[PDB]
């Protein structure tokens, strides 16, 4: 009972599931394509807590995998390298055939730890995690993904750290060096943060010993 998209004589129209349309000429299977779209194009925030809060763990329900031939380039993508509080891997390893999406600009890894009760991390609004051209309903460990939907129609690594990943009370950091971190805030975009990381690193005004120095961005 899945609807398809079809092009009208003018603009785009909803193709029916039940009605036979006389103008809907289908001469080949090459006219039916699976296209992936990124939800960032619908205004979904790409901040770290904004995306992680949209994901969560649940038990019982099995994963599903779907196939694309084409899709949108993503500006912002994520991975996860999250372990349970005692190090016991929150996500299952991506199975054979699951690879990250073709291309993006800013890819985040959000490594870290947190409570992860459940069998899988599912998207809360039901968006798909887009891997390669094989999107799925769950997040797989170590493999990057885009956040998106399936239409059915006729760079750089940031590697933020995470604490308390699978719960509501969390912390996230941008790593400049092994001893140097910056606290994240949603008002600061990847461009800001990366310009900031180059300034800190290049100026050298950061920890240079063995101890951690963690910076907060001034309120202004």
């Amino acid at each position: 009972s899945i609807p398809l998209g079809v092009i009208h004589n003018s603009t785009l129209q909803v193709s029916d599931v039940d009605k036979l349309v006389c103008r809907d000429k289908l001469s080949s299977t090459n006219q039916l394509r699976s296209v992936g779209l990124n939800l960032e194009g619908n205004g979904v925030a790409t901040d770290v807590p904004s995306v992680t809060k949209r994901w969560g763990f649940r038990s019982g329900v099995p994963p599903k995998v779907v196939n694309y031939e084409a899709g949108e380039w993503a500006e912002n993508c994520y991975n996860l390298e999250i372990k349970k509080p005692d190090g016991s891997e929150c996500l299952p390893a991506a199975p054979d055939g699951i690879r990250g999406f073709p291309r993006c600009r800013y890819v985040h890894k959000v490594s870290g730890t947190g409570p992860c009760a459940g069998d899988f991390a599912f998207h809360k609004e039901g968006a798909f995690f887009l891997y390669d051209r094989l999107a799925s309903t769950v997040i797989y460990r170590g493999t990057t993904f885009a956040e998106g939907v399936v239409a059915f129609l006729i760079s750089t690594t940031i590697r933020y750290q995470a604490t308390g990943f699978g719960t509501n009370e969390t912390e996230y950091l941008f790593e400049v060096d092994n001893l140097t971190y910056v606290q994240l805030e949603s008002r600061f975009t990847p461009q800001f943060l990366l310009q900031l990381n180059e300034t800190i690193y290049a100026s050298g005004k950061r920890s240079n010993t063995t101890g951690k120095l963690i910076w907060k961005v001034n309120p202004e």
Epitope: L196, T199, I200, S207, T210
Partner: antibody, heavy 121, light 107 residues
Framework: QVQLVQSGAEVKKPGSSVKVSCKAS????????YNWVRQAPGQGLVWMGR????????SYAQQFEDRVTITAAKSTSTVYMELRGLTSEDTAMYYC??????????????WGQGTLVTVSS | QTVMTQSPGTLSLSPGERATLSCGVS???????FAWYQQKVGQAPRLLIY???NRASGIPDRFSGSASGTDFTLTISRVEPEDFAVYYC????????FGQGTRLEIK
């Protein structure tokens, strides 16, 4: 020698907060780390936190986390700190000290007079 | 984290006598991330030595020192009346730390 100028002593009641500041003059505000430190008589000196206007970042001593907020007014070349949740144990001289970040070194070469923060009831 | 203990925590010498002070640290500090200070009573401390060896501006040649590992040492060839100060050990390469301070008193 770049100077740091501070306000005089103030008495606070427990549970309140004090805002202190150091006016920087005779040199660059942006180029240096302005560090806040605390010294009560007989206790020695500890670091509270810092601001580096050039990076726009600040950092803190763990024992002063949340209670101490450090900022700066680039426009007035003034270093600011607010200490809150004050108790009688917080009585101390509060200082700014400017480091030698512009020289490639992080220790303190320039020091203020010290503002006394007194907390009592 | 770079915990320092100054020893002696106090010295007692007649002015004109030779004195030494050292600080132990719980972890190695590169000498380049360590400095010595002289604190006069009622005053902010004055930087004496940079990188645990280089005299700071305006510092007399009677002051000297060196360091490696966890061993930081300050000496004054002759302690003048003006030198009976509290000396401090500072770590500054990361979140900074200080030792408790050592007072050099007049005997």
């Amino acid at each position: 020698q770049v100077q740091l100028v501070q306000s005089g002593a103030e008495v606070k009641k427990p549970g309140s907060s004090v805002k202190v500041s150091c006016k920087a003059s005779g040199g660059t505000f942006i180029d240096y780390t302005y560090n806040w430190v605390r010294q009560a008589p007989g206790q020695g000196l500890v670091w509270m936190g810092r601001v580096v206007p050039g990076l726009g970042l600040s950092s803190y001593a763990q024992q002063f986390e949340d209670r101490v907020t450090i900022t700066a007014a680039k426009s007035t070349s003034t270093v600011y700190m607010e200490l809150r949740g004050l108790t009688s144990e917080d009585t101390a001289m509060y200082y700014c000290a400017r480091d030698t970040a512009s020289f490639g070194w992080l220790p303190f070469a320039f020091w203020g007079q010290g503002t006394l923060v007194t907390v009592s009831s | 984290q770079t915990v320092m203990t100054q020893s002696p925590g106090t010295l007692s010498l007649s002015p004109g006598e030779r004195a030494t002070l050292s600080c132990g640290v719980s972890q190695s500090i590169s000498s380049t991330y360590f400095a010595w200070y002289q604190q006069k009573v009622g005053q902010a401390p004055r930087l004496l030595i940079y990188g645990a060896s280089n005299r700071a501006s305006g510092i007399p040649d009677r002051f000297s020192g060196s360091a490696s590992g966890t061993d930081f040492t300050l000496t004054i060839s002759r302690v003048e009346p003006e030198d009976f100060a509290v000396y401090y050990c500072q770590q500054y390469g990361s979140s900074p730390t200080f030792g408790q301070g050592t007072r050099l008193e007049i005997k």
